[PDB]
């Protein structure tokens, strides 16, 4: 759609709301809107006020200590895109010291062309994390939001979601503006061109929102340009662009320039025509034409002077630098002072860099996000007419990340007067400052303490010279290093090597943890070298060296270093096998489980496992198994330095078990084993097999198989012999294959119609007596059952022996 209403050049509202009615009939604003400093206001007063008309704000929106307001949704329900051409301290939208502000309420804002949002110190705001700035801005990192109600306290952001939710870091979350409004999200294909309710794409040139999908005429904002409602990407003549959002006929710019010239406003600009653009003033290399408002290029080298008030300016934020955009000659001094934390070099070189000459001095103080002054693209000369105090022309102080001064491969420079000053620049190099000194031509204008010899680059790596590892020797835990001796022009300047190292499991290693070893410089052959200690076997390590020199400022000796070098130790005997367990799942099957050694000490080739069968206890064959307690178990110089100083004086200073190779397997099954019998098993991890196999200590373990069933039960019938004295000697073949062994045989013999008596036939009772014997039995039918008790347990009672004595 078109933009009904006026254009409302940027204003501010102060001290009461009665002025706000100036926004009655306009949907766009040329400039910035400031609502701030409300004291005698209350929510019922805000509830009446509203402005559905406003759509897009040119420069910025600022709210600062407005009382009685709780939610902006009822004020600006249609703000869609913030142009942000001229920011407010590198921030497109500032929400500061909002008391009573409960929730934002900007559910129609889509994009901010250039800028950032800073909301802080409100202690009344929540529903903050439930919004996604990524779909709103392009540089999320530049945002700065702290000290709210949502963060310190736990204001619940209760909202439907019904509404889209998406991931931000590692989990999904709803993207909601209000308790009744939620962020408009749509497919990334039409990244900014807009998207209707049903998800259909808007026009290509369109932006944010549209009523008719893929239709330029029925949009609410379009990224390119505006003209006559139906906006076009680039309007043709006779329409010249203006404020980078709308183009007008020549008559409009002509009459407004005349209105500025006749009414001598201190702020109005004599607009010019240049490349079909009615800009406030065209840059150097052009001259205003009185006849036609075009500014024709000049027939001479006249730069655009950019005079400074009070001969000095401070650059701290984007808005500070934008005043100097297009300027090329500065009749003053410049003080870069960027209290930051986030990089700004982009917009600085975008707006600065076109400057060439500085009449006064330059000074870079306390800046932190600066990485290199290279963003001063075309600066060539520093006349330094306005000499800074202490007779200084170039200055520096406490710049924590000032890495590079300028690209001296191609960039010239010239300093007329004044001397330097450098202090507290931990990320600089004396090489760089010396290079600037040579290029400047002020080489004879350097004096003591104008260049701190220590604070300039405390922790960097720009020794500019290389060292070579003369010899390397490897071993298990000792690595011998040797390198070419280094000798600056004066050997006294060299003060010692530093060998830095760190274990390196991978290849990605930085430069400049990182354990250090000091090396005494050698005496002028005799490679300094060093021998390593305390290594873990079969592990890679990154190693390099570094030189140390004196101040050496009069000369240009900066030491040297070696490149980062990877080298790994050797393999050795592995560690003990881990988790050795043995469970016999069957009478002959045993499962063995183990884990790889805690120190494999190289690629584990295999496991070596041996086993055998123990022998039963001898005492188990000569134990009384029916006496009390018959429970059978079921299964400091001293001596150490004596030889040490002995060697000191002598040396003196000179003036078969079954086994297999288990490969790639932590679980074994063993068969062919005697049922209910203990077995001895050992295992050794082996990280080297074919070349004189190297294996660790044996993994001792023992396990007994599951018992059988028929083994305990007695095999063979029962025989009896009766003598004249009614004594019955009983024979029965024992289970010669029991579960381990049989300790006793229980004999349950009864009379006919009488009680049943139990007799013990132990191993010695069965063997020594050769069977068993019953004495003192009266005539009558009998019934004798025999049960064998083995190691596992008891057997089966034999058939009753029917006989008469």
């Amino acid at each position: 759609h078109l933009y009904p209403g006026e254009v409302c050049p940027g204003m501010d509202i102060r001290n009461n709301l009665t002025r706000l009615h100036e926004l009655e009939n306009c949907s766009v604003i040329e400039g910035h809107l400031q609502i701030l400093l409300m004291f005698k206001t209350r929510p019922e007063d805000f509830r009446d006020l509203s402005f559905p008309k406003l759509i897009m704000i040119t420069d910025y929106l600022l709210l600062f200590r407005v009382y009685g307001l709780e939610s902006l949704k009822d004020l600006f329900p249609n703000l869609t895109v913030i142009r942000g051409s001229r920011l407010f301290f590198n921030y497109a939208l500032v929400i500061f010291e909002m008391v009573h502000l409960k929730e934002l309420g900007l559910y129609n804002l889509m994009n901010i062309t250039r800028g950032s949002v800073r909301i802080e110190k409100n202690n009344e705001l929540c529903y903050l994390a439930t919004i996604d700035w990524s779909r709103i801005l392009d540089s999320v990192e530049d945002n700065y939001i702290v000290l709210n109600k949502d963060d310190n306290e736990e204001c619940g952001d209760i909202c439907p979601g019904n509404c889209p939710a998406t991931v931000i870091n590692g989990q999904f979350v709803e993207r909601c503006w209000t308790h009744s409004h939620c962020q408009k999200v749509c497919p990334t294909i039409c990244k900014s061109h807009g998207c209707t309710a049903e998800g259909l794409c808007c026009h290509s040139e369109c932006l944010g929102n549209c009523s008719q999908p893929d239709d330029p005429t029925k949009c609410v904002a379009c990224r390119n340009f505006y003209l006559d409602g139906r906006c076009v990407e680039t309007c043709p003549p006779p329409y010249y662009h203006f404020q980078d959002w709308r183009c007008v006929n020549f008559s409009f710019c002509q009459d407004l320039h005349h209105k500025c010239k006749n009414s001598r406003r201190q702020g109005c600009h004599q607009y010019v025509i240049h490349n079909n653009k009615c800009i406030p003033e065209c840059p150097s290399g052009y001259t205003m034409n009185s006849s036609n408002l075009l500014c024709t290029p000049c027939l001479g080298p006249c730069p655009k002077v950019c005079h400074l008030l009070e001969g000095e300016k401070t650059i701290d934020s984007v808005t500070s630098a934008q005043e100097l955009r297009g300027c090329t000659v500065i009749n003053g001094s410049l003080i870069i002072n960027i209290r930051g934390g986030n990089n700004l070099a982009a917009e600085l070189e975008a707006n600065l860099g076109l400057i060439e000459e500085i009449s006064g001095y330059l000074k870079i103080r306390r800046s932190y996000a600066l990485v290199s002054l290279s963003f001063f693209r075309k600066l060539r000369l520093i006349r330094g007419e306005t000499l800074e105090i202490g007779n200084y022309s170039f200055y520096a102080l406490d710049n924590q990340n000032l890495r590079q001064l300028w690209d001296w491969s191609k960039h010239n420079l010239t300093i007329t007067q004044g001397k330097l000053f450098f202090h507290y620049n931990p990320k600089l190099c004396l090489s760089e400052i010396h290079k600037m000194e040579e290029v400047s031509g002020t080489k004879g204008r350097q004096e003591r303490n104008d260049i701190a010899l220590k604070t300039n680059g405390d922790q960097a790596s720009c020794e500019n010279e290389l060292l070579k590892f003369s010899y390397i020797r490897t071993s298990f835990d000792k690595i011998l290093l040797r390198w070419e001796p280094y000798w600056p022009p004066d050997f006294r300047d060299l003060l010692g090597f530093m060998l830095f190292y760190k274990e390196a499991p991978y290849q990605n290693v930085t430069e400049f943890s990182w354990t250090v070893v000091d090396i005494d410089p050698p005496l002028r052959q005799n490679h300094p070298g060093w021998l390593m200690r305390g290594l873990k076997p079969w592990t890679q390590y990154a190693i390099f060296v570094k030189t140390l020199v004196t101040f050496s400022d009069e000369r240009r000796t900066y030491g040297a270093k070696s490149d980062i070098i990877y080298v790994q130790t050797d393999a050795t005997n592995p560690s003990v096998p881990l988790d050795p367990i043995s469970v016999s799942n069957s009478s002959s099957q045993i499962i063995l489980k183990w884990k790889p050694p805690s120190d494999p000490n190289g690629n584990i080739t295999h496991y070596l496992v041996f086993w055998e069968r123990q022998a039963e206890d001898s005492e188990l064959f000569e134990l009384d198994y029916c006496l009390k307690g018959l429970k059978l178990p079921s299964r400091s110089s001293f001596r150490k330095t004596f030889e040490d100083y002995l060697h000191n004086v002598v040396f003196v200073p000179r003036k078969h078990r079954p086994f297999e190779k288990v490969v790639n397997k932590e679980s074994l099954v063993i068969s062919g084993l005697r049922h209910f019998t203990g077995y001895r098993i050992e295992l050794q991890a082996c990280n080297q097999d074919t070349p004189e196999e190297r294996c660790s200590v044996a993994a001792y373990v023992s396990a007994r198989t599951m018992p059988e069933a028929k083994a305990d039960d007695i095999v063979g019938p029962v025989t009896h012999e009766i003598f004249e004295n009614n004594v019955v000697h009983l024979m029965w073949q024992e289970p010669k294959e029991p579960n381990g062994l049989i300790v006793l045989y229980e004999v349950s013999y009864r009379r006919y119609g009488d009680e049943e008596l139990h007799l013990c036939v132990s191993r010695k009772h069965f063997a020594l007596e050769r069977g068993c014997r019953l004495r003192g039995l009266s005539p009558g039918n009998y019934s004798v059952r025999i049960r064998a008790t083995s190691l596992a347990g008891n057997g089966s009672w034999t058939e009753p022996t029917y006989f008469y004595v």
Binding site: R473, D520, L531, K640, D644, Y645, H647, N648, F651
Partner: protein, 41 residues
Amino acid sequence: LCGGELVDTLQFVCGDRGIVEECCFRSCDLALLETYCATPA
């Protein structure tokens, strides 16, 4: 390194050719071990 394992160090650094008080008690200084080599042994 102390008695016995410094024999490995002397095997390494000295190659093909006071003690223990310097490595078990004091710091093993490497260059001290080098001049210890019994070249006329």
